[PDB]
């Protein structure tokens, strides 16, 4: 068969709402694994300066203490069934994931129902996990692209709830007690901001009967009718530059505010971002690589790596490029990156956009190949897009994108805009912000 | 419906498997038995330069046409190399899988291997060795195999610095002539029809239809290396001889690995059923990571304990872990914990199955080494057929066999192999 | 020339038609404003009278 | 007659008297300099020796005697399987740029 | 079973080196060799105005 | 380090001492690759303040009288009195480091634990070292009646360089066999040399060759004596090892008192001891401790 018939033959996600409003979705396929996870809409957003590390602390803390199965009885039960867990926490999503066999499904959803509602919070575990969180946050300074992405989120959205980290600062970790964490659990872990993603190996009527038995009546009504509210965060085009000249490699990111999740143009900004592409120095393509920024970078030995990202949040996104470069070619990488960006934005070709559309189609089906990242897509799509967009509709959104369409909405979201610039390392040969802005908008057009 | 994988054999000699999933992703993978144990001591690092030479020129397409064609279709061309096997793997869109198939079969069948391309590629060899030795696991895994084997499997996965600058295209051509041939080649396909893959394999794989140059039998060496690194995290691993993959002792040894903690099942947890982690954490309070790892090749295998510790308490960590495996060898075991190890191995094999690149690697290694595809339910029946006395016998075999230890870090309190 | 003639370069030239034509009108209007041509400045109604 | 006219053209060109064969008197463009990177080492070494000896001879404004002139039948076209490969690779690169 | 990731779980990236190729005096004589062995152990001399000498 | 490691042999001796000891003699004499950029002034001051002691050191002089040396020793030398750490007994380990270098000549060395300086067996091990041969006496010669270069050249037509190797310390010495060869026939020279020492461990030796070994050792000690740099090194080594000077005529008497059965006992201790091997080059035919 063909591509459109094959992505039609990819099975649908039945999404259903329980008696409290919690959303349940599954993707039944042929494999015998089973990847049930709860996605909660809490994150670093919907946190103030107080209780800032509460989402990362509860992500760390939901496995260690339980009301019904106390101590390490969660670990003993999940290794009696032999399963694997995961807990990633982002700026707008926190999640709990179990990959298992499909014959352990009431044990998996019972362990999730004891994780997300009946988690106990012992103060000895609070002190021990506070020490482990402080040691991990000291270890996280080596994670330099995470440092630069956190600096970019600090300098891109200053004065907003998106300025703060997911982990929280060290002056805010040390004052987090139990009652602030259970206030965060009573506020932001509410049931219709929670989805139950399954992927293959399951049956949806079995999952809805088990969600009626276990994950029903979590919490629906607020305490004093005090609803949380999302705000449109201000994007401030700024520059932060952490200068460490003894450090070997400079990580510099440049990002413009993109439209975000609910706006329909993430496909065309992603196909511009995928025309620009990515490079690391272990890639054996050489000079003959298709992306001309990577071809120029390996032609004149500019940088070690560059990665072009479209990180999206609800109405606010960061789309840009982060490069690991040396101390002597940041001006070259910034000039050739803005030249490739606005060569794309002025002179986009049909061969370039069909290369990008093909690499986006392959990147989306390679992302949604595996059961754990397709559950990541099910949870993120159910919390953000409302419905879950199937890949036939993603193909129909991809196939309408042409070079003219890309040129004007690139002129909307790229041209003459003030970007946010972050840098950790030897940031001396970064240009100053007026040279970044003069290297944005073109001398010809 | 996804039909069962046909695992057929060509009269040329190649093992070809293909199924149609009516998939978004069509992945085609050619699997060669031409790894680091198959290269010799005179031509060392030839497997690393052949792994980096997947994007080079070939008899049928230039390297610019290769890279622009794979990027214009949108697929990826990546090769995964063990010490035993190499696996060229191209995934992409189902419409242009013919163009991906001709590019991959040109690259794997008839490379030109021109001298300026490999003279450019030796800088990429240095960069790939530096990136892969930024991780501390791969360095002592390579020196662990160097001290654990004598001649064949002791050849490193990455090219050493003495051969960097001396890898010749004539030696590359001699190794790809003597070890890329049809009777050791297995070509598997997910989302590609079997008659189409039969036609592409017969139209481009009539060349190089021999059995190949025979690899040497690996023998056990023993002894230590112990070397200094310069960090507080000391990585030390003690292994011994286990059976080859496809043997009942190796099926016992993998469930003894999952009894003694194959990895972090819980993110940011404590791993409170792994007996190695319990018997180390009852005596140590510093941060650590004690696992057991198994690696079974076609002739001989390694089973052992990998301990990452701080430099002060690493002697107590290694001796407490070795006394825990002594307790398993005398037989202090719980049958519910053995059943939990069996369920951990069955679930981890299903994690290996459930990804399509992992499923392609699974049937590529099965059709490459064994030549037959067992069902995963038959694998679950074999793991359920493994019982407690085989775990006791394999723990006695590991504690009574000759050991080999690779260590790296501040070594002032790291114990020796005679001190164990 | 032979490498510069193609479909992609014709599409890039079609993309660069209106801004280069507008730059040509920028150069023509600037040349008219610099030299003060009596045929052309007598057609604009704001400079219609004598200047 | 055409081989005799080509040998008379080889004698009238003057670099057979001076010590160079056909592929040393090429204009060093980016294709020829890519072929300069793409020769083997011995051919590169005696090619740059022949260019250095030719520069010595045109510094001294004299030529070798006739017994050691490079004959037309003694000419080898060493750069041509490299230069034709570079020219066809540049041709397929410009056709992919036109595509 | 017969795989690389099925044997060891987290150790598949360290025993399986993937590589994305695209984006997603020599003493030649026996009589001259007499003196290159080790008679006496490692002695290192570093001077102020004399060069390095090794006594073997 | 990068100039001093252009010699191939010192890398083999450094890897040999890294293999053949557990701690407190297994530290390399040259600096490791990572400590350059890590050695601090506090570390050097701790090493000097612990281990540069007037009760530990000695001061010897050649051409200078005793009076100004005793005045300088009273003036600027007699301050330190704390002996520091005394080492950790240098326990034997045994094993293999077998790296590859790409040279045509493999350099291998097989070594067992021997006695220390001041014992009654180090003189017999040095008589055995000069019996197996360690010096190019006739330069560009065959080095004929040395036993290792005899028994290798009985079987091998390859170019080689085989010698004995004695590394005597104050805790436990190291006696071994050094082979430099072409890599195609490393097993022949290594097994022929080890079969020569296995032959001399059974008593297959001549007392005229023991007398030639004794005269070669007496000649080598007087080679160490005759230069004033070497005399300064010998007086300093005897001063640190013993504390009282032993005359070279009594050194000739102690070398002459080595019996013919004592070097047979020394070769038996070399054979029956645990082995240690350091090798580098192309390692296709280099044998192992199982094959030796």
Curated annotation (Swiss-Prot), chain A:
The modification Phosphoserine is found at residue 177. It comes from the Eukaryota. GO terms for cellular component: mitochondrial inner membrane; mitochondrion; myelin sheath; respiratory chain complex III. Expressed in neurons and astrocytes of the cerebral cortex and hippocampus (at protein level). This is Cytochrome b-c1 complex subunit 1, mitochondrial. Component of the ubiquinol-cytochrome c oxidoreductase, a multisubunit transmembrane complex that is part of the mitochondrial electron transport chain which drives oxidative phosphorylation. InterPro entries: Metalloenz_LuxS/M16, MPP/UQCRC_Complex, Pept_M16_N, Peptidase_M16_C. The modification Phosphothreonine is found at residue 179. It comes from Mus musculus. GO terms for biological process: cellular respiration; mitochondrial electron transport, ubiquinol to cytochrome c; mitochondrial respiratory chain complex III assembly; response to activity; response to alkaloid. Acetylation of Lys-103 is observed in liver mitochondria from fasted mice but not from fed mice. Belongs to the peptidase M16 family. UQCRC1/QCR1 subfamily.
UniProtKB/Swiss-Prot annotation, chain B:
PROSITE patterns: INSULINASE (PS00143). Acetylation of Lys-126 and Lys-217 is observed in liver mitochondria from fasted mice but not from fed mice. The keyword Hydrolase does not apply. Pfam families: Peptidase_M16, Peptidase_M16_C. The modification N6-acetyllysine is found at residues 33, 166, 217. GO terms for molecular function: metal ion binding; metalloendopeptidase activity; protein-containing complex binding. One of its GO terms (biological process) is response to xenobiotic stimulus. It is found in: Mitochondrion inner membrane. It is a peripheral membrane protein. GO terms for cellular component: mitochondrial inner membrane; mitochondrion; myelin sheath; nucleoplasm; respiratory chain complex III. Component of the ubiquinol-cytochrome c oxidoreductase (cytochrome b-c1 complex, complex III, CIII), a multisubunit enzyme composed of 11 subunits. The complex is composed of 3 respiratory subunits cytochrome b, cytochrome c1 and Rieske protein UQCRFS1, 2 core protein subunits UQCRC1/QCR1 and UQCRC2/QCR2, and 6 low-molecular weight protein subunits UQCRH/QCR6, UQCRB/QCR7, UQCRQ/QCR8, UQCR10/QCR9, UQCR11/QCR10 and subunit 9, the cleavage product of Rieske protein UQCRFS1. Keywords: Acetylation, Electron transport, Membrane, Mitochondrion, Mitochondrion inner membrane, Phosphoprotein, Respiratory chain, Transit peptide, Transport. Its main location: mitochondrion. It comes from the Eukaryota. InterPro entries: Metalloenz_LuxS/M16 (IPR011249), MPP/UQCRC_Complex (IPR050361), Pept_M16_N (IPR011765), Pept_M16_Zn_BS (IPR001431), Peptidase_M16_C (IPR007863). The keyword Membrane applies. The modification Phosphoserine is found at residue 335.
Curated annotation (Swiss-Prot), chain C:
Its main location: mitochondrion. It comes from the Eukaryota. GO terms for cellular component: mitochondrial inner membrane; mitochondrion; respiratory chain complex III. It is a single-pass membrane protein. InterPro entries: Single_a-helix_sf (IPR029027), UQCR (IPR015089). One of its GO terms (biological process) is cellular respiration. Residues 1-15 are mitochondrial matrix. It holds the Pfam family UCR_6-4kD. It is found in: Mitochondrion inner membrane. Keywords: Electron transport, Membrane, Mitochondrion, Mitochondrion inner membrane, Respiratory chain, Transmembrane, Transmembrane helix, Transport. The keyword Hydrolase does not apply. The chain crosses the membrane at residues 16-37. Residues 38-51 are mitochondrial intermembrane. Component of the ubiquinol-cytochrome c oxidoreductase (cytochrome b-c1 complex, complex III, CIII), a multisubunit enzyme composed of 11 subunits. The complex is composed of 3 respiratory subunits cytochrome b, cytochrome c1 and Rieske protein UQCRFS1, 2 core protein subunits UQCRC1/QCR1 and UQCRC2/QCR2, and 6 low-molecular weight protein subunits UQCRH/QCR6, UQCRB/QCR7, UQCRQ/QCR8, UQCR10/QCR9, UQCR11/QCR10 and subunit 9, the cleavage product of Rieske protein UQCRFS1. Component of the ubiquinol-cytochrome c oxidoreductase, a multisubunit transmembrane complex that is part of the mitochondrial electron transport chain which drives oxidative phosphorylation. Belongs to the UQCR11/QCR10 family. This is Cytochrome b-c1 complex subunit 10. It comes from Mus musculus (Mouse).
UniProtKB/Swiss-Prot annotation, chain E:
This is Cytochrome b-c1 complex subunit 9. It comes from Mus musculus (Mouse). Component of the ubiquinol-cytochrome c oxidoreductase (cytochrome b-c1 complex, complex III, CIII). UQCRFS1 undergoes proteolytic processing once it is incorporated in the complex III dimer. One of the fragments, called subunit 9, corresponds to its mitochondrial targeting sequence (MTS). The proteolytic processing is necessary for the correct insertion of UQCRFS1 in the complex III dimer, but the persistence of UQCRFS1-derived fragments may prevent newly imported UQCRFS1 to be processed and assembled into complex III and is detrimental for the complex III structure and function. Component of the ubiquinol-cytochrome c oxidoreductase (cytochrome b-c1 complex, complex III, CIII). Subunit 9 corresponds to the mitochondrial targeting sequence (MTS) of Rieske protein UQCRFS1. It is retained after processing and incorporated inside complex III, where it remains bound to the complex and localizes between the 2 core subunits UQCRC1/QCR1 and UQCRC2/QCR2.
């Amino acid at each position: 068969a063909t591509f459109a018939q094959a992505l039609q033959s990819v099975p649908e996600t039945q999404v259903s709402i329980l008696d409290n409003g919690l959303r349940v979705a599954s993707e039944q396929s042929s494999h015998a694994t089973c990847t049930v996870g709860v996605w909660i809409d809490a994150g670093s957003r919907y946190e103030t300066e107080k209780n800032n590390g509460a989402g990362y602390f509860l992500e760390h803390l939901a496995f260690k203490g339980t009301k019904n199965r106390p101590g390490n009885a969660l670990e003993k039960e999940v290794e009696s069934i032999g399963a694997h867990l995961n807990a990633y926490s982002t700026r707008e999503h926190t999640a709990y994931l179990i990959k298992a066999l499909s014959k352990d499904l009431p044990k998996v959803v019972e362990l999730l129902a004891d994780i997300v509602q009946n988690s106990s919070l012992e103060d000895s575990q609070i002190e021990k996990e506070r020490d482990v969180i402080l040691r991990e946050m000291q270890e996280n300074d080596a994670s330099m692209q995470n440092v630069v992405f956190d600096y970019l989120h600090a300098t891109a959205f200053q004065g907003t709830p998106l300025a703060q980290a997911v982990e929280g600062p060290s002056e805010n970790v040390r004052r987090l007690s139990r009652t602030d964490l259970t206030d965060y659990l009573n506020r932001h872990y509410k049931a219709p901001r929670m989805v139950l993603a399954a992927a293959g190996g399951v049956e949806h009527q079995q999952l809805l009967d088990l969600a009626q038995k276990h994950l029903s009546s979590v919490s629906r009504v607020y305490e004093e009718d005090a609803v949380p509210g999302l705000t449109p965060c201000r994007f401030t085009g700024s520059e932060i530059r952490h200068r460490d000249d003894a450090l070997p490699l400079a990580h510099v990111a440049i990002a413009v505010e993109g439209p975000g999740w609910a706006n329909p143009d993430n496909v065309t900004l992603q196909v511009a971002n995928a025309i620009i592409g990515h490079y690391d120095c272990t890639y054996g393509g050489g000079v003959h690589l298709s992306s001309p920024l990577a071809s120029v970078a390996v032609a004149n030995k500019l940088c070690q790596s560059f990665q072009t990202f479209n990180i999206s949040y609800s109405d606010t996104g960061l789309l840009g490029a982060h490069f690991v470069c040396d101390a002597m070619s940041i001006d070259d990488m910034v000039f050739f990156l803005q030249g490739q960006w606005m060569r794309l934005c002025t002179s986009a070709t049909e061969s370039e956009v069909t290369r990008g559309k093909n690499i986006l189609r392959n990147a989306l089906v390679s992302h949604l190949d595996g059961t754990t990242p397709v559950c990541e897509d099910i949870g993120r799509s159910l919390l953000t897009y409302g419905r879950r967009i199937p890949l036939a509709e993603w193909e129909s959104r991809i196939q309408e994108v042409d070079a003219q369409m890309l040129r004007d909405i690139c002129s909307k979201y790229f041209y003459d805009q003030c970007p946010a610039v972050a840098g950790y390392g030897p940031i001396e040969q970064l240009p100053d912000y007026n040279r970044i802005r003069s290297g944005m908008f073109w001398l010809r057009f | 419906q996804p039909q069962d994988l046909e695992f057929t054999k060509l009269p040329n000699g190649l093992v070809i498997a293909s199924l149609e999933n009516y998939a978004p992703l069509s992945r085609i993978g050619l699997f060669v038995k031409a790894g680091s144990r198959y290269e010799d001591s005179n031509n060392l690092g030839t497997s690393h330069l052949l792994r980096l030479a997947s994007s080079l020129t070939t008899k049928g397409a230039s390297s610019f046409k290769i890279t622009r064609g794979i990027e214009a279709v949108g697929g990826k061309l990546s090769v995964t190399a063990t010490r035993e096997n190499m696996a060229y793997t191209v995934e992409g869109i189902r419409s242009d899988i013919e163009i991906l198939m001709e590019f991959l079969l040109n690259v794997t069948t008839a490379p030109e291997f021109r001298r300026w391309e490999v003279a450019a590629l030796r800088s990429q060899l240095k960069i790939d060795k530096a990136v892969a030795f930024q991780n501390s696991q791969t360095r002592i895994i390579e020196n662990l195999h160097d001290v654990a084997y004598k001649n064949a499997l002791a050849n490193p996965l990455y090219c050493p610095d003495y051969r960097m600058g001396k890898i010749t295209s004539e030696e590359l051509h001699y190794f790809v002539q003597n070890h890329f041939t049809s009777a050791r080649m297995a070509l598997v396909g997910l989302g590609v029809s079997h008659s189409v893959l039969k036609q592409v394999a017969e139209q481009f794989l009539n060349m190089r239809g021999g059995l190949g140059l025979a690899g040497a039998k690996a023998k056990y060496r023993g002894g230590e290396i112990r070397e200094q690194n310069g960090d507080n995290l000391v990585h030390a691993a003690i292994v011994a001889e286990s059976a080859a993959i496809g043997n009942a002792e190796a099926n016992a040894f993998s469930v003894l690995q999952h009894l003694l903690g194959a990895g972090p099942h819980i993110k940011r947890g404590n791993n409170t059923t792994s007996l190695l982690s319990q018997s180390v954490a009852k005596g140590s309070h510093q941060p650590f990571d004690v696992s057991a790892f198994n690696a079974s090749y076609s002739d001989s295998g390694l089973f052992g304990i990998y301990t990452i510790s701080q430099a002060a308490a690493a002697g107590e960590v290694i001796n407490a872990a070795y006394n825990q495996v002594k307790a398993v060898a005398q037989g202090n075991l719980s049958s519910a914990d053995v059943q939990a190890a069996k369920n951990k191995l069955k679930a981890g094999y299903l994690m290996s199955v459930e990804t399509s690149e992992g499923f392609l690697s699974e049937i590529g290694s099965q059709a490459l080494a064994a030549g037959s595809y067992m069902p995963p339910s038959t694998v679950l029946q074999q793991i359920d057929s493994v019982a407690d006395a085989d775990v006791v016998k394999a723990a006695k075999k590991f504690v009574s066999g000759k050991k080999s230890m690779a260590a790296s870090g501040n070594l002032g309190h790291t114990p020796f192999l005679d001190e164990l | 020339l032979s490498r510069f003639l193609g479909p992609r370069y014709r599409e890039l030239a079609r993309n660069w038609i209106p801004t280069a034509g507008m730059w040509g009108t920028v150069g023509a209007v600037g040349l008219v404003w610099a030299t003060d041509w009596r045929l052309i400045l007598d057609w604009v109604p704001y400079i219609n009278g004598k200047f | 007659w055409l081989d005799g006219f080509r040998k008379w053209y080889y004698n009238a060109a003057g670099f057979n008297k001076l010590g160079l064969m056909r592929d040393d008197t090429l204009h060093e463009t980016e294709d020829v300099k890519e072929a300069i990177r793409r020769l083997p080492e011995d051919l590169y070494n005696d090619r740059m020796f022949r260019i250095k000896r030719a520069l010595d001879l045109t510094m001294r404004h004299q030529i070798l005697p006739k017994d050691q002139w490079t004959k037309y039948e003694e000419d080898k076209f060493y750069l041509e399987p490299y230069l034709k490969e570079v020219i066809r690779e540049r041709k397929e690169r410009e056709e992919w740029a036109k595509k | 079973m017969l795989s690389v990731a099925a044997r060891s779980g987290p150790f598949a990236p360290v025993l399986s080196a993937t590589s994305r190729g695209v984006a997603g005096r020599p003493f030649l004589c026996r009589e001259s060799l007499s003196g290159q062995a080790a008679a006496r152990p490692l002695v290192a001399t570093v001077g102020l105005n004399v060069p390095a000498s090794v006594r073997f």
